[PDB]
Design a protein around this ligand. Structure first.
Ligand SMILES: Nc1ncnc2c1ncn2[C@@H]1O[C@H](COP(=O)(O)OP(=O)(O)OP(O)(O)=S)[C@@H](O)[C@H]1O
Ligand SMILES: Nc1ncnc2c1ncn2[C@@H]1O[C@H](COP(=O)(O)OP(=O)(O)OP(O)(O)=S)[C@@H](O)[C@H]1O
Ligand SMILES: [Mg+2]
Ligand SMILES: [Mg+2]
Lengths: 455, 101, 442
């Protein structure tokens, strides 16, 4: 079963980066360099190429991760004229894909910028990704606009398609397996973006802990739909629902049952394990237990009906009726970190150290994706597979033991990691891009060097 | 509750490798003959065993840059993955031309 | 020519430590090892040693930088064991009188009560000044000293502890009220996590330019009138405290963080308030706090409320006249207002670290008045995860202490630590399922 992988995030006319391609390794891609180099920003460009939605795009500083105080981060990292941020994909169908974002500053009065998602299909593996947005006049490069790209391809075996609504962009990447989740509604974009954001600043992404069940659980659009209908027929059923639930929950509980097993030999500092303990609200537990053994029938809206039933078990606190259908509502998810002390302990930042928290965090993220993908097998083909990739800016927080463990993992499940070592030492396995910000005529100018194959 | 106190010394002759590599590359400064790491590397590896292969790389690179910057690096052209070894490892970087001071 | 510093932090019974002594370096102390080995925690008590205030002590985790979620556990509880625990420091006054400051420690809440130990001989390892052959409780220990030669003082209210440390020669500031301490701990927090202390920037003048408590008392009484004097006062109170800063700046000129070649404090005279001092300066027409409240009632702005003496009161606090700003340098446009969303991880800390010096420096001087002229307070900050700083970036930090006569406690999980200064290596391993940490130096 073939699985797609990104090959190059080439940034154009960005801060300190003119035409610098970035080749991603099958597994790890480490950005080596000194302070204020271009590591983070390089990823910035990446992040952008996926979620070109400015609403969510906010590049704070790794010195502020819980900053619910929404100046920005995206403007500066680009220079005057036309810029880009593109991605090279190796679709499970060995199809090269050029999903990119075009950028260009705006009237200097307010740090505002513009975005136009675009893609390029059937791009002869002979031409370099960078030789798509360049010319040669008087021996000095010339970045070309999208209307320029159009013409250079208008009549060719190569197809080009500018987009208007992010959805068009997004949905496209998903159709070709670049995106794991269905990026339909905008609220969806939040979940995704925050994961990407979460991978960055590293740690136990708080925001993905409160709505912890909003990410790991498929709310079946089949349930509500098919279920309701049964009623449309009934009018012109009893506990057949009760059966549906504890089997639908048993199902997903078996889903979660395994993903955990996928995380046992993980060792970060003291953390020797991360699980997704699935608990069922007593409130609903006795209800599921109620609509089973006992039987006090009141056949007078199944929705409405069920509601009254909550009055039975609940001597506390319509809408109760319906809500009480969805799989989720009958649960209470959580996360725990295995140690040598008190066996397993609910995940808690205040109780963990920098490293221990990042790993756990990474985990939770690993799980996020290892849920969205499969939860999408239906809406996908039997021959397409999404790409799995995460981040870990300032990966120096991880020693040797921790960092290494991160590797064996991506290898464990098939993934890629664009880590960044503010320090020069780092893993020998994988690709390494050493950066050096130079000054030529008082102009930024990053200096890249490649290394891969060592192993 | 016991308590002593013991200090350990860390000896990294990595400093010599650097100095020898400094002059080895510095050698290129004097002469206008650029520093093609596709050759500087493919040759230098032949000296030290593949045990400390990686480390040697970084330093030749780290040093190869503190000395200058590619010229056709502003001509926007994808640098090809110039391979080395008989196995896998490779390097990506245009020749290093004009100097800095 | 005098100087005071830190000699050793001490833990007792703490989780993973039955009793350890970390001898503070002359210039810079560093902690390295494996993720979660006992680094931060070691500093945690250092922070808990200087500020034993459960209302302020809140060790969230790095990943959470600016978390206003004070709902969770302040996290310090599980950082120690149960029963009898201790936090103690070893500092040498400018007078060289070895001092011992620290505190005892013991839902999930924590009890704490401070203490001191004067006139104690040096030839005695404080380690045995709390350990017996076991730990001999607070009650056992007071007898130890009594007859012999030493001063242990069971502190009631926390105010005194500080009011004891400052009088001796430790705290670079008069921790009088909660107001005063709240700000202190915040700086220390800012040094622990790094970056531009979101808090300090929004209220710069509150951690730089002190109050001339007098201009307030003296002024009001008199009437029991004036003129261009009160106005005159402020001016020379501003230009004075302005040249103060001027110099504080001239020190941080050869900093080197990423692309930041400098930090500064742009002291500016508010448009609003500026107009007042130009009007009272040479012109005139028609509480004296009230009179002012009216002259300001001419210059028409936006926001407009107020009591005449709460206004004049605010226009007698020279500080409300100024509006500070922190700026960084770059090969680019260079002098630009610092901005978290601008500087990279490193740059951030470098700058952030700088300002804290403005704080301490300014504070130190802010109280040379109410302190022995022979003593020179000890200055020291923190920097957990310094692994985020590269060589050049770290070098500069070092060079600074040798410029600001100071000490810096850092912590890099990184296996590569400098060489300039003693360094400790910690390795935690399971033993009888009891958290244990092996402490060795390198
Ligand atoms: N919004 C912005 N405005 C102006 N300059 C910016 C902005 N964002 C980034 N930069 C520039 O980019 C550099 C920082 O780049 P990054 O990619 O964050 O560096 P870094 O290599 O990640 O540094 P660390 O995190 O310290 S390891 C600075 O030197 C800035 O001049
Ligand atoms: N609130 C707590 N309750 C119980 N144990 C704790 C608590 N906070 C931390 N710990 C333990 O202390 C260890 C972390 O100690 P620290 O000294 O903070 O580690 P650290 O080495 O500073 O972390 P880095 O920066 O990630 S390398 C973990 O292994 C935990 O088991
Ligand atoms: Mg820590
Ligand atoms: Mg950064």
């Amino acid at each position: 079963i073939a699985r797609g992988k990104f090959r190059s995030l080439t940034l154009i006319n960005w801060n300190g980066f003119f035409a610098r391609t970035f080749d991603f390794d099958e597994l790890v891609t480490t950005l080596s360099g000194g302070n204020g180099a271009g590591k983070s920003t390089t990823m910035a460009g990446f992040v952008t190429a996926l979620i070109p939605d400015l609403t969510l795009l906010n590049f704070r500083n790794t010195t502020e991760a819980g900053s619910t105080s929404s100046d920005k981060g995206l403007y500066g990292k680009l220079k005057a004229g036309v810029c880009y941020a593109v991605l090279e994909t190796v679709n499970s169908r060995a199809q090269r894909i050029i999903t990119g974002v075009r950028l260009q500053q705006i009237a200097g009065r307010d740090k505002k910028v513009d975005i136009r998602p675009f893609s390029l299909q059937n791009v002869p593996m002979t031409d370099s990704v960078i030789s798509l947005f360049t010319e040669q006049v008087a021996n000095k490069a010339r970045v070309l606009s999208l209307n320029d790209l159009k013409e250079k391809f208008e009549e060719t075996a190569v197809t080009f398609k500018p987009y208007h609504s992010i959805t068009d962009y997004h949905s496209f990447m998903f159709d070709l397996g670049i995106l794991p989740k269905r990026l339909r509604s905008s609220s969806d974009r939040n979940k995704f973006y925050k994961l990407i954001e979460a991978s960055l600043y590293g740690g136990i992404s708080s925001v993905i802990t409160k709505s912890l069940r909003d990410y790991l659980l498929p709310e079946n659009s089949g349930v509500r739909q098919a279920f309701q209908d049964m009623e449309a027929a009934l009018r012109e059923s009893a506990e057949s629902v009760a059966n549906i639930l504890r089997k639908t929950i048993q199902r997903e509980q078996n889903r979660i049952l395994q993903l955990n097993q996928g995380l046992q030999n993980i060792a970060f500092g003291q953390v020797k394990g991360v699980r997704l303990v699935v608990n069922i609200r007593d409130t609903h537990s006795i209800l599921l237990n109620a609509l089973s053994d006992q039987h006090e029938q009141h056949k007078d809206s199944f929705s409405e009906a069920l509601a009254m039933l909550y009055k039975r078990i609940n001597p506390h606190i319509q809408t109760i009726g319906e809500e009480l259908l969805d799989y989720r509502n009958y649960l209470d998810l959580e996360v725990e970190t295995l140690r040598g002390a008190y066996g397993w302990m609910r995940a808690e930042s205040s109780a963990l150290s920098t490293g221990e928290a990042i790993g756990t965090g990474m985990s939770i993220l690993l799980m996020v994706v290892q849920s969205w993908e499969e939860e999408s097998r239906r809406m996908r083909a039997k021959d397409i597979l999404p790409c799995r990739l995460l981040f870990l800016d300032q990966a120096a927080r991880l020693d040797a033991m921790s960092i290494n463990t991160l590797f064996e993992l991506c290898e464990r499940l098939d993934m890629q990691l664009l880590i960044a070592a503010p320090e020069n030492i780092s893993p020998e396995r994988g690709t390494t891009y050493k950066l050096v910000r130079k000054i030529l005529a008082n102009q930024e100018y990053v200096h890249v060097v490649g290394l891969k194959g060592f192993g | 509750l016991p308590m002593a106190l013991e200090y350990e010394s860390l000896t990294d002759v990595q400093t010599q490798i650097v100095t020898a590599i400094q002059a080895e590359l510095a050698h290129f400064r004097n002469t206008a003959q650029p520093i093609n790491l596709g050759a500087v590397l493919q040759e230098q590896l032949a000296r030290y065993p593949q045990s400390r292969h990686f480390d040697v790389a970084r330093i030749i690179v780290d040093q190869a840059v503190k000395l200058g910057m590619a010229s056709q690096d502003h001509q926007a052209v994808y640098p090809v993955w110039q391979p080395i070894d008989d196995f896998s490892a490779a390097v990506q970087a245009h020749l290093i031309d004009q100097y800095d001071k």
